[PDB]
Amino acid sequence: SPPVHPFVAPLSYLLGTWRGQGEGEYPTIPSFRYGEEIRFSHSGKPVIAYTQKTWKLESGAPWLAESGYFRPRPDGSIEVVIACSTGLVEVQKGTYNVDEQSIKLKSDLVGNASKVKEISREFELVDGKLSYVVRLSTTTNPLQPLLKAILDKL
Amino acid sequence: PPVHPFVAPLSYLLGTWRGQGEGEYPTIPSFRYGEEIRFSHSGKPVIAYTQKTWKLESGAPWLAESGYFRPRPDGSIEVVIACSTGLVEVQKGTYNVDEQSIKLKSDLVGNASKVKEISREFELVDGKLSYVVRLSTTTNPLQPLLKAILDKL
């Protein structure tokens, strides 16, 4: 109930809880589905808190989780910092587009994962639903899609 | 779910802690803050950590951080933290069941060009959670920055 800070207001469409499912595929793995829930919340500051958890679609058993903070600026730039339950950290930097309701991020740092070279994350509201693509590049492989999901707002 | 065996030795952390701290550093004039930390789990060998601080006078939200504690049965532990200020940390160290303590030093501080290292040491004293955070910057040696004491709710 504190007001959305003017710096966060252009991203106010994110605030709430989203739940849906994703798909992971990478040249290394065989392809898999997962349930996902993301919550974007705030406390009146110029940051949005992000928390996410995934689960195996059929058993319901908890899978992974991550959490962090989205820091939009009014020039349209944004940095996002994320810690993952696997022990990875990321600093993502990029831009947001108000007209298109999208966010395009590429990793400036991937921490504590030597096999990982870059991670990119793009969000886009499509038909009222929050969608994303995560791309990963490794010491083995080029930057390519890894995870895609579309989630409904609760 | 039940506590994972890797998590069991640190199960004393699980729940919500509330108290206050004080920060001081040769460049910063001394300041106090309120703080609340929540340690939780979902049966995996990982504890989720979320923290917030506020101004004592006004109750105004101040800073927040969140991440994960990953204890292993050799007594090692890795902690990954992302901060509302735009920092990330990978902290590595040990926990000691006897001394009820966790001692961590950063392997990595990300996105903060003048912060060089951060160490975080927790101890349960008399049932309260106490910690010390030490910081080194480009121009100041590693030394204490934050000290806090929290009561379990």
UniProtKB/Swiss-Prot annotation, chain A:
Its cofactor is heme b. Heme b binds at residues 28, 146. Binds 1 heme b group per subunit, that coordinates a highly solvent-exposed Fe(III) atom. It catalyses: peroxynitrite = nitrate. InterPro entries: Calycin (IPR012674), Nitrobindin (IPR045165), THAP4-like_heme-bd (IPR014878). Its EC number is 5.99.-.-. GO terms for molecular function: isomerase activity; metal ion binding. Gene3D superfamilies: 2.40.128.20. Pathway: Nitrogen metabolism. Keywords: Cytoplasm, Heme, Iron, Isomerase, Metal-binding. It is found in: Cytoplasm. A motif (GXWXGXG) lies at residues 16-22. CDD domains: lipocalin_heme-bd-THAP4-like. GO terms for cellular component: cytosol. It comes from the Eukaryota. Coiled coil: none annotated. Belongs to the nitrobindin family. Heme-binding protein able to scavenge peroxynitrite and to protect free L-tyrosine against peroxynitrite-mediated nitration, by acting as a peroxynitrite isomerase that converts peroxynitrite to nitrate. Therefore, this protein likely plays a role in peroxynitrite sensing and in the detoxification of reactive nitrogen and oxygen species (RNS and ROS, respectively). Is able to bind nitric oxide (NO) in vitro, but may act as a sensor of peroxynitrite levels in vivo. Forms a 10-stranded antiparallel beta-barrel structure able to accommodate a hydrophobic ligand in its interior. In fact, this fold hosts the heme group, which is located in a wide surface cleft. Homodimer. This is Peroxynitrite isomerase Rv2717c.
